[PDB]
């Protein structure tokens, strides 16, 4: 196979500053492909990857002492420690495998790699470092460390385990932020994705938050393959299920912020939300919950999810009933009196879908006096409210 192209790439790297021309030639992406390549299993053997990272060391270390030349060495050094550690874990997994004679001396202790992943996490907050991690294949390395640990100790409560799970995740947050190509790469890592989604059931609500924002980022401006993957790994259902059980306000904020993105993808995701028991009641419950910090943060995200899923609820009487018995329609009208742009916009969008093709509720809105409230918002400064108002008014005026 292409084991040999790593032999030639290392040989080109060996000579005194001929690796300067290699980066010019664009060998870095080729090196990363041998080391992580999932551009689709384009990553070579262990002996092949040993050569690659070595050649990759030689090329980055054969630069001038520039500012960009010192970030790359600082970063690569850390990534090399992570890569080397991952090699310890993969060797353990192959040795402690079904059919394998488990009677020979190797276990990798997590505590040694946590300081290394800590630094990277902190550094990923800087754009310049992100750019460097990006061309050094940082994202994939950080992600590989995440998945391999979850695979080894599934949902443990060990402090040192949680910590690295939390660090790695926070870096993957920064690295996917605004980066369309990184959101795609991580989503293509199907093994790592399942690991992430699986951590939502962790008892650590600090970690659950570090999973929620990652899935939030991945669901923002996602490509078609990414939206497909996020759907397939059932992240939607997983999030909703952990939201029904989260205690901390911050954790909920994060979780709801992710679902709000995902609820805009497809009617398949909308249905997935509605399928979960008590989810709808929970959402309607959020329509009145005020947070300690950022008062209306949950009302906004809750009403937003509901605003999206309201399109489906309109077809279901049972789901309109769950909505009616948790006092939704009445709450949405009190939302119209709000001073918030987001809150009003959600209520209008929600009432839009709910006011049509159902006399059972559209008479209830009349008896609530919604007409005297919507006419206040037909001449508003934003169409979303204005069109949300008049269309709901049209649905009501049809039934007098």
């Amino acid at each position: 196979d292409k084991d040999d192209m790593s032999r030639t790439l290392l040989a080109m790297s060996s000579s005194q500053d001929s690796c300067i021309s290699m980066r010019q030639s664009g060998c870095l992406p080729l090196l990363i492909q041998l080391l992580h390549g999932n551009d689709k299993n384009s990553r070579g053997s262990k002996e092949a990857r040993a050569r690659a990272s070595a050649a990759l060391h030689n090329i980055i270390h054969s630069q001038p002492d520039d500012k960009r030349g010192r970030r790359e060495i600082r970063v690569l050094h850390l990534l090399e420690q992570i890569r080397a550690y991952c090699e310890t874990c993969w060797e353990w997994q192959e040795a402690h495998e079904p059919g394998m004679d488990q009677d020979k001396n190797p276990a990798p202790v997590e505590h040694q790699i946590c300081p290394a992943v800590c630094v990277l996490m902190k550094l990923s907050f800087d754009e310049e470092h992100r750019h460097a991690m990006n061309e050094l294949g940082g994202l994939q390395a950080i992600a590989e460390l995440l998945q391999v640990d979850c695979e080894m100790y599934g949902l443990t409560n060990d402090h040192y385990s949680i910590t690295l799970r939390r660090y790695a995740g926070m870096a993957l947050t920064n690295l996917t932020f605004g980066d369309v190509a990184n959101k795609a790469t991580l989503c293509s890592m199907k093994g790592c994705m399942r690991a992430l989604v699986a951590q939502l059931k962790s008892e650590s609500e600090d970690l659950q938050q570090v999973i929620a924002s990652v899935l939030r980022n991945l669901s923002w401006r996602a490509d078609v393959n990414s939206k497909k993957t996020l759907r397939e790994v059932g992240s939607v259902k997983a999030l909703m299920e952990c939201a029904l059980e989260v205690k901390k306000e911050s954790t909920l904020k994060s979780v709801l912020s992710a679902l709000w993105n995902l609820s805009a993808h497809c009617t398949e995701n909308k249905a997935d939300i509605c399928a979960v028991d008590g989810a709808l009641a929970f959402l309607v419950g959020t329509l009145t919950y005020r947070s300690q910090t950022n008062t209306l943060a949950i009302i906004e995200s809750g009403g937003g999810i509901l605003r999206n899923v309201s399109s489906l609820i309109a077809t279901n009487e049972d789901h309109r009933q769950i909505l009616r018995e948790n006092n939704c329609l009445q709450t949405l009208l009190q939302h119209l009196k709000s001073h918030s742009l987001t809150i009003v916009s959600n209520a209008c969008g929600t009432l839009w879908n709910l006011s049509a093709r159902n006399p059972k509720d559209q008479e209830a809105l009349w008896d609530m006096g919604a007409v005297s409230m919507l006419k206040n918002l037909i001449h508003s400064k934003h169409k979303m409210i204005a069109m949300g108002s008049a269309a709901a008014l049209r649905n009501l005026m049809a039934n007098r």
């Binding site: 996490m121 902190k122 907050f125 939390r166 995740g169 926070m170 870096a171 947050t173 920064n174 996917t176 932020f177 605004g178 600090d206 938050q209 570090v210 924002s213 939030r216 980022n217 669901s219 923002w220 401006r221 911050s250 904020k253 994060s254 709801l256 912020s257 992710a258 679902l259 709000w260 993105n261 805009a264 910090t293 950022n294 209306l296 943060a297 906004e300 995200s301 937003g304 918030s340 742009l341 987001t342 916009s345 959600n346 979303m384």
Partner: protein
């Protein structure tokens, strides 16, 4: 008329809120004077260290000084990642 809340969706952010979660305190240095007459907003002067309490949104963060708390635009602030 100021809007601290963008109604698009959940959007995307960095891991700032996560730097808070573990119980540790993270804060940010003021790059310019934030002048406001609104009780909803936290005004400050350049060089002031503001503790960020919420950074869910990208435009506006909820922060607090020993005086009080309110909204401010993230632009006015460089946040310190390391020990504080």
């Amino acid at each position: 008329s100021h809007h601290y809340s963008h109604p698009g969706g959940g959007g995307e952010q960095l891991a700032i809120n996560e730097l808070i979660s573990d119980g540790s305190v993270v804060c940010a240095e003021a790059l310019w004077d934030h002048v406001t007459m609104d009780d909803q907003e936290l005004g400050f002067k350049a060089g002031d260290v503001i503790e960020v309490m919420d950074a869910t949104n990208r435009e506006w963060w909820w922060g607090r000084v020993a005086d009080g708390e309110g909204w401010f635009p993230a632009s006015f602030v460089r946040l310190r990642v390391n020990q504080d």
